[PDB]
Amino acid sequence: KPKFLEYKTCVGDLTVVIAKALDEFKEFCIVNAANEHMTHGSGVAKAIADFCGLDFVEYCEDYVKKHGPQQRLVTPSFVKGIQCVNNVVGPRHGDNNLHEKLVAAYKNVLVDGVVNYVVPVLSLGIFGVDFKMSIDAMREAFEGCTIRVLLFSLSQEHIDYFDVTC
């Protein structure tokens, strides 16, 4: 574990992010910005499902079959060095108290025993959410945690905002 919370950033395709995490963390959890049926049909979820492959997709599929929709689901990754995938569902369309719900979503990123995380900016498609709200909520959620977090995005704007709020 690190002595204090440590952040890294990466602006790039998931392949770049994962190469960086493999090199710099060695082992880590990847966070997926999931939906409650864990179907991975667009956005970063599609990228993660593409990267991790059919055993990952089928694990998610089978779990939701047995247990119904989920708001958080930690699965095998089927990729060397990726300790697990933590599939986190943020707030819903029409939800109130978005900052609160975003904070909860980022707190749901933590996985027992895991120290290193690769984390996307959650919930940008949700009515009422913007990346500044989301990154602020992330910082609130992780404050005091002795973990390493690689924040990633395709958008430099996002990481710039992270950088200025350090």
Curated annotation (Swiss-Prot):
Cofactor(s) in the UniProt record? Zn(2+)
Q: What is this protein called?
A: Papain-like protease
Topology class, membrane:
Multi-pass membrane protein
Catalytic reaction annotation: Thiol-dependent hydrolysis of ester, thioester, amide, peptide and isopeptide bonds formed by the C-terminal Gly of ubiquitin (a 76-residue protein attached to proteins as an intracellular targeting signal)
What does the record give as the organism's lineage? Viruses, Riboviria, Orthornavirae, Pisuviricota, Pisoniviricetes
Q: State its location(s).
A: Host endoplasmic reticulum membrane; Host cytoplasm
Give the species.
Avian infectious bronchitis virus (strain Beaudette) (IBV)
What residues does the Macro domain cover? 1-166
Q: What is known of its domains?
A: The hydrophobic region HD1 probably mediates the membrane association of the replication complex.
Q: What does this protein do?
A: Responsible for the cleavages located at the N-terminus of the replicase polyprotein. In addition, PL-PRO possesses a deubiquitinating/deISGylating activity and processes both 'Lys-48'- and 'Lys-63'-linked polyubiquitin chains from cellular substrates.
